[PDB]
Amino acid sequence: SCPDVQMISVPGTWESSPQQNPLNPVQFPKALLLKVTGPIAQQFAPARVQTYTVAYTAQFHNPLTTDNQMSYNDSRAEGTRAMVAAMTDMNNRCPLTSYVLIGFSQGAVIAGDVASDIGNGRGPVDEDLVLGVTLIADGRRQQGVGNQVPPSPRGEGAEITLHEVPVLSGLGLTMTGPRPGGFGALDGRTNEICAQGDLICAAPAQAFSPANLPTTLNTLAGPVHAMYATPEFWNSDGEPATEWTLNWAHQLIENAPHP
């Protein structure tokens, strides 16, 4: 039957595959957002919430290397389509079900993109069905767009800082810049978490100066970005990003409608 709430989780790069079962994501045991969706499935009955972890290639080809990876552009498109498909399917079958959306890194870009569509009335579901959105290490993070969960580092996402750089898009990694329409009606319910020094979501222009560029490329390739389950580089009163998000989601599901 229909869960009152579907919690959709979009993993980061190297944390999903198209073959991973969204209802039982065991292929990538170290994936960050499992620390949120795992406990949620334990704290609530299946009738109250279903967790869904998006199955997608989740890769990021480095053009400077000979890795066998899918381009960022193609991986990101696949994940976006998969996320939209999950929401479309759930809303088709269960029109009264509400949503909690979370994403990390490449998954945060994807989830934020879909949140922007929903908030601007572009679908796949009406905005009133979305309870909340939390984005960890969003590559399109923008000061003034969404709620920056304190502490909020200076700077904006790499896809903003690098939006006008030549060559990258043609190479298969388009830096897509600010989201048109921001999060629209979801602005008040969309949260951005970003740790100081995470160049994915907080990327000062100076990070790409000649002096800093090789270090920056090493950092981006893969660290602060890997530590969001710890309080080391980001915490709220000691609470790591995964714990903040778990508590946030728990409260949304608790107060969710009973259709």
Automatic annotation (TrEMBL):
Domain of life of the native organism: Bacteria
MF GO annotations: carboxylic ester hydrolase activity
Keywords of this entry: Disulfide bond, Hydrolase, Membrane, Serine esterase, Transmembrane, Transmembrane helix
UniProt similarity note: Belongs to the cutinase family.
Protein name (database record): Cell wall synthesis protein CwsA
Species annotation: Mycobacterium tuberculosis
Shown stretch of the complete protein: 71 to 333 of 336
